[PDB]
PDB file of C-alpha atoms and ligand atoms in Angstrom:
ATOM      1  CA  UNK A   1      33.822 133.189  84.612  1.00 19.72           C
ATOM      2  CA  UNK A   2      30.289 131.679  85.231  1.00 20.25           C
ATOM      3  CA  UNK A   3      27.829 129.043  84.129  1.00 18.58           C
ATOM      4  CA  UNK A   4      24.811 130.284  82.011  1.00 20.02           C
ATOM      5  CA  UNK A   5      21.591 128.425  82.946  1.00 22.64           C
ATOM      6  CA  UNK A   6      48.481 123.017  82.338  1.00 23.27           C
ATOM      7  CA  UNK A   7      50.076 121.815  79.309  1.00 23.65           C
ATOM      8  CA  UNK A   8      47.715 118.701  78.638  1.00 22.90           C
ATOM      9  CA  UNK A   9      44.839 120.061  80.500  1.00 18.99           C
ATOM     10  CA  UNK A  10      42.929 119.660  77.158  1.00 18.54           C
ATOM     11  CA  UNK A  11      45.276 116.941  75.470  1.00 19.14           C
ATOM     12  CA  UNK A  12      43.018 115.366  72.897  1.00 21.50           C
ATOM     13  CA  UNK A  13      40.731 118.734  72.832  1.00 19.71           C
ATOM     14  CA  UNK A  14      39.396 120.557  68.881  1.00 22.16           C
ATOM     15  CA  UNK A  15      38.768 123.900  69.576  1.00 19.24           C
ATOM     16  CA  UNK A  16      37.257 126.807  67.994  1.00 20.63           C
ATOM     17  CA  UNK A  17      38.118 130.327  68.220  1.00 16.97           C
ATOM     18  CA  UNK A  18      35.712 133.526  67.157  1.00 13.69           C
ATOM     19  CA  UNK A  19      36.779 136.580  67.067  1.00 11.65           C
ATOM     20  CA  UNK A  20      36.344 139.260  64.989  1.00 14.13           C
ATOM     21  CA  UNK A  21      39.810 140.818  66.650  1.00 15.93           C
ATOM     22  CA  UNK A  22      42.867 139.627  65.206  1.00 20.98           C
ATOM     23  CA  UNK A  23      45.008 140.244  68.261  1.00 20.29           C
ATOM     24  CA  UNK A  24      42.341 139.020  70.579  1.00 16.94           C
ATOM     25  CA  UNK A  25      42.129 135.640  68.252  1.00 17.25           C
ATOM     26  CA  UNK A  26      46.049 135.461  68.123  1.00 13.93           C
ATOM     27  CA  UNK A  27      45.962 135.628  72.175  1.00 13.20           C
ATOM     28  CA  UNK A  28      43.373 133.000  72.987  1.00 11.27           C
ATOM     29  CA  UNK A  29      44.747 130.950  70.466  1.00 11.20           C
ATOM     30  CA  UNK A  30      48.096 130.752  72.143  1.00 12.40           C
ATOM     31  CA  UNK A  31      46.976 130.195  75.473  1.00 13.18           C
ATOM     32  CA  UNK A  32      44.997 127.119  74.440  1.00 14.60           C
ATOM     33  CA  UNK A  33      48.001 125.687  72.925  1.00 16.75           C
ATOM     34  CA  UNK A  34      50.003 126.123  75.817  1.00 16.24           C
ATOM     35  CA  UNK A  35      46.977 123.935  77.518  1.00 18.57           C
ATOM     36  CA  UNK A  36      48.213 121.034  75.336  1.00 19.18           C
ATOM     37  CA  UNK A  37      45.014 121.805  72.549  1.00 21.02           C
ATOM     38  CA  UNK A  38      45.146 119.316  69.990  1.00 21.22           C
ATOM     39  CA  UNK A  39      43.694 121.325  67.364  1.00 18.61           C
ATOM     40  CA  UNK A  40      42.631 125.249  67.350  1.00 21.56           C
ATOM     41  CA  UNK A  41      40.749 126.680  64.689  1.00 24.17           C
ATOM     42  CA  UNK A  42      40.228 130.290  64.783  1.00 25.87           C
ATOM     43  CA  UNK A  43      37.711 132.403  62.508  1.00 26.68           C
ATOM     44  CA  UNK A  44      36.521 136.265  62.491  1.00 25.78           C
ATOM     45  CA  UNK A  45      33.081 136.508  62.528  1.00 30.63           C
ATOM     46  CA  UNK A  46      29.755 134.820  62.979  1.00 27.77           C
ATOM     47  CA  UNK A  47      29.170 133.837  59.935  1.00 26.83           C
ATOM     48  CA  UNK A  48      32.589 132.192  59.330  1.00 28.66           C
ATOM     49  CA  UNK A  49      31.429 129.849  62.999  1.00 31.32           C
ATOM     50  CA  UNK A  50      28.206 129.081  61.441  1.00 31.90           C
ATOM     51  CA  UNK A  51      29.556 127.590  57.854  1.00 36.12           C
ATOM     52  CA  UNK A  52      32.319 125.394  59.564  1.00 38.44           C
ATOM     53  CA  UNK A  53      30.225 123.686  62.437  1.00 38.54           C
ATOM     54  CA  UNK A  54      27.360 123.276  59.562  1.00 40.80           C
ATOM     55  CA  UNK A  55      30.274 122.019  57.488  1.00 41.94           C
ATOM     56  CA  UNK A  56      32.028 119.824  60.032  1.00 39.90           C
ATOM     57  CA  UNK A  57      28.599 118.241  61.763  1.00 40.78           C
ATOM     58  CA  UNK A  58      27.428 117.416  58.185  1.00 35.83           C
ATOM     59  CA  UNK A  59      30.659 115.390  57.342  1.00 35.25           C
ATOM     60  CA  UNK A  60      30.884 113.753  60.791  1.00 36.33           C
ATOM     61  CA  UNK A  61      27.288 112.144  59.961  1.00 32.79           C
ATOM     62  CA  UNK A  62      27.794 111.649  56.666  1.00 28.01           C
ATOM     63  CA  UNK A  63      30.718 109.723  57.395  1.00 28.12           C
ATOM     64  CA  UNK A  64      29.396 108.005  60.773  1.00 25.17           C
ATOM     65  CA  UNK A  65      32.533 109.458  63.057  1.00 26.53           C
ATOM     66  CA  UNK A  66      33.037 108.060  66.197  1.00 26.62           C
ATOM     67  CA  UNK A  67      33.186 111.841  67.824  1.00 26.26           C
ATOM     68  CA  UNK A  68      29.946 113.489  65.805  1.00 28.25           C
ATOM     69  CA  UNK A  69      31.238 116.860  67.053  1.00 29.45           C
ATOM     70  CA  UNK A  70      33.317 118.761  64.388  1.00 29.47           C
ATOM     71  CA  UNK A  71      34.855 120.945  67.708  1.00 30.01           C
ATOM     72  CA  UNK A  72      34.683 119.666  71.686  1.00 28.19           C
ATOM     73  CA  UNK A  73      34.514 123.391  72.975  1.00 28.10           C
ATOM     74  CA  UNK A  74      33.778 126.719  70.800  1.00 28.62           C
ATOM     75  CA  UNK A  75      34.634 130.233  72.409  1.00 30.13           C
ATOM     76  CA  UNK A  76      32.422 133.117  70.893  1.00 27.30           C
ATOM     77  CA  UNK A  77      32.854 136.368  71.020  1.00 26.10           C
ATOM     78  CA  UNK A  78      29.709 138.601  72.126  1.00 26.62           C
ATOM     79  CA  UNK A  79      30.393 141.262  69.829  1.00 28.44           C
ATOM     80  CA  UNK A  80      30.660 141.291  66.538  1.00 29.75           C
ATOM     81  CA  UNK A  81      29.189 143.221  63.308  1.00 32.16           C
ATOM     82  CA  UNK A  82      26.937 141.841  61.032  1.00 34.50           C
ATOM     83  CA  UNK A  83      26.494 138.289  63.185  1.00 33.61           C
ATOM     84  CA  UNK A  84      27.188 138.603  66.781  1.00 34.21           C
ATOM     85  CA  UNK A  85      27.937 135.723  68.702  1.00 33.19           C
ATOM     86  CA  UNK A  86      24.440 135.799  70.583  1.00 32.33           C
ATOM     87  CA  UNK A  87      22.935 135.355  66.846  1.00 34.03           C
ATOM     88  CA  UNK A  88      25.704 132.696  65.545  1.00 35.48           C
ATOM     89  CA  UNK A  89      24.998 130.861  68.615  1.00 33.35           C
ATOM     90  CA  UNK A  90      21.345 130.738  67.772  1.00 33.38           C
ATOM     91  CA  UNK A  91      21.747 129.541  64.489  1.00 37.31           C
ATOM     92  CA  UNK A  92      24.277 126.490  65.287  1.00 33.81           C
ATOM     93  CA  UNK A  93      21.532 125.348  67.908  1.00 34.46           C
ATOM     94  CA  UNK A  94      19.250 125.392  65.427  1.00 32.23           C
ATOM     95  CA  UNK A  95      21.534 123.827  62.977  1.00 29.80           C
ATOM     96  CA  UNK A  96      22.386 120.936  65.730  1.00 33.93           C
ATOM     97  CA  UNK A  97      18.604 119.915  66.157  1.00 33.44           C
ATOM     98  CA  UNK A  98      18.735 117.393  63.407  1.00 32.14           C
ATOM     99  CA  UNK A  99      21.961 115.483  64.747  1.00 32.73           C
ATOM    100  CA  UNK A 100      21.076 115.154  68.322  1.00 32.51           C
ATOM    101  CA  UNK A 101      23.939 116.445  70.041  1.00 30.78           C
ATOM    102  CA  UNK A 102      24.914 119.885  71.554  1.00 28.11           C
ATOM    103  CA  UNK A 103      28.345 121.260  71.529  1.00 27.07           C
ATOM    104  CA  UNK A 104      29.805 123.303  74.099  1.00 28.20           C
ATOM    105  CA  UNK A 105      29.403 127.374  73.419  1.00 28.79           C
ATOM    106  CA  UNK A 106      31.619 129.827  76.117  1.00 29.39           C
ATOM    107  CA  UNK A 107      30.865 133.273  75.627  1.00 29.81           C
ATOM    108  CA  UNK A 108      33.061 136.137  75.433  1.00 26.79           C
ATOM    109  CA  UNK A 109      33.289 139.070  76.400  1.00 26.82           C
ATOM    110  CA  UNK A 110      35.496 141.869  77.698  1.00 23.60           C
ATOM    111  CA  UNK A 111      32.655 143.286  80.048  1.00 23.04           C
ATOM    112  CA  UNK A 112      30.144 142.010  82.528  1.00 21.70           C
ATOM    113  CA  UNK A 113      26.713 141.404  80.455  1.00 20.87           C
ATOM    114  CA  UNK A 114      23.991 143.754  81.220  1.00 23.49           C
ATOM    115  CA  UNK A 115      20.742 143.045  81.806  1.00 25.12           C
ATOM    116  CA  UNK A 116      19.786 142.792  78.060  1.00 25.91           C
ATOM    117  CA  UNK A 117      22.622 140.865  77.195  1.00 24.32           C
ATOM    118  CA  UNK A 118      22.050 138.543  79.803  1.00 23.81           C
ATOM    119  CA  UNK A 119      18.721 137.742  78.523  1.00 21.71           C
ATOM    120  CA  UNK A 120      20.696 136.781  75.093  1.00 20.39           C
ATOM    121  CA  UNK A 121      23.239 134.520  76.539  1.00 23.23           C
ATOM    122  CA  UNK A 122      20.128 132.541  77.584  1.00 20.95           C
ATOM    123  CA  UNK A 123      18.430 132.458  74.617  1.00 21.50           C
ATOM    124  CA  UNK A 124      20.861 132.206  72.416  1.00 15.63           C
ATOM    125  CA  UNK A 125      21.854 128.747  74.215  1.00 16.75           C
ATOM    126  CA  UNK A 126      25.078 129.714  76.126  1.00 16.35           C
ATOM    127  CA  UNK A 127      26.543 127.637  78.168  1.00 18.24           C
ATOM    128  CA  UNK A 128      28.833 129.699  79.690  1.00 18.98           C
ATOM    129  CA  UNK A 129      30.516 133.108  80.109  1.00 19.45           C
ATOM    130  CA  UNK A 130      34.009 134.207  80.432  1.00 22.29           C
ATOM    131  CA  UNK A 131      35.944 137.491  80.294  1.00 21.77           C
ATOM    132  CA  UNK A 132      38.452 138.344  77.587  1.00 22.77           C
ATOM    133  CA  UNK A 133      41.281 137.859  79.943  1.00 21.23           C
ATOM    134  CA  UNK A 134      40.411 134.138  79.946  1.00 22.77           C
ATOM    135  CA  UNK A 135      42.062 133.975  83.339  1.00 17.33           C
ATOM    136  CA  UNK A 136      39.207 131.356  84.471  1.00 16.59           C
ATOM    137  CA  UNK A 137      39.326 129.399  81.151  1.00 15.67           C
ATOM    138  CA  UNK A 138      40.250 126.127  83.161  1.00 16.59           C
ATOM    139  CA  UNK A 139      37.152 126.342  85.643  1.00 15.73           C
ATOM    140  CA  UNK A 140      35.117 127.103  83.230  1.00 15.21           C
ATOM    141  CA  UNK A 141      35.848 123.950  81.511  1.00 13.86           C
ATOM    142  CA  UNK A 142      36.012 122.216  84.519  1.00 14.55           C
ATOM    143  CA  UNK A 143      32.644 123.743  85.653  1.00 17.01           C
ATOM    144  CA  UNK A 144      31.142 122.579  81.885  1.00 15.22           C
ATOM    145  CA  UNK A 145      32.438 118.820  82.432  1.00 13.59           C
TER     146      UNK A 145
HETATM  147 MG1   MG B   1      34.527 141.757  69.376  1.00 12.29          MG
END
């Protein structure tokens, strides 16, 4: 847990998973569903993040949505080949400039940052870091809200 500068406990909630870990995915998958999750989506890598919240924010405006967020919270994993969730982060900032809004981004990791990575959360646009256990997932939220 920390802020980067019960079964319906997110009732009414879209998610997105990233992970490039299939077991990992599988696990926080499941324990958002037992939070009362409306809708999980989970995808492996980066890239994957990056096409479906460029895809879903595109259809939301074109179609003038009430909610213009294709996903209310997204949990990223830190590592990851070829786009690493520091990078795909970047890029679906960059991506949300034109609509005006900013979704929430967790980070994940199953280590304290250092230093270096510390710096990235920041500038990647983080808004929030939690271990892989996702034992503080609530608070998190709660701290987000
Ligand atoms: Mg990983």
């Amino acid at each position: 847990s920390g802020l980067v500068p019960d079964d319906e406990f997110l009732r009414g909630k879209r998610v997105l998973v990233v992970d490039d870990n299939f077991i990992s995915r599988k696990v926080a998958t499941g324990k958002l569903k037992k939070m009362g999750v409306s809708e999980v989506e989970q995808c492996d890598s980066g890239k994957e993040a990056l096409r479906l919240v460029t895809e879903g924010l595109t259809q939301r405006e074109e179609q003038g949505s009430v909610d213009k967020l294709p996903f209310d919270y997204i949990f990223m994993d830190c590592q990851m080949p070829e786009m690493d969730g520091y990078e795909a982060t970047r890029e679906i900032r960059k991506v949300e400039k034109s609509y005006g809004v900013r979704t929430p981004i967790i980070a994940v990791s199953g280590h304290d940052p250092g230093s270096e990575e510390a710096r990235e959360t920041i500038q990647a646009g983080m808004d929030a870091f939690l271990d892989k256990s996702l034992n503080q997932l609530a608070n998190v939220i709660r701290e987000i809200e």
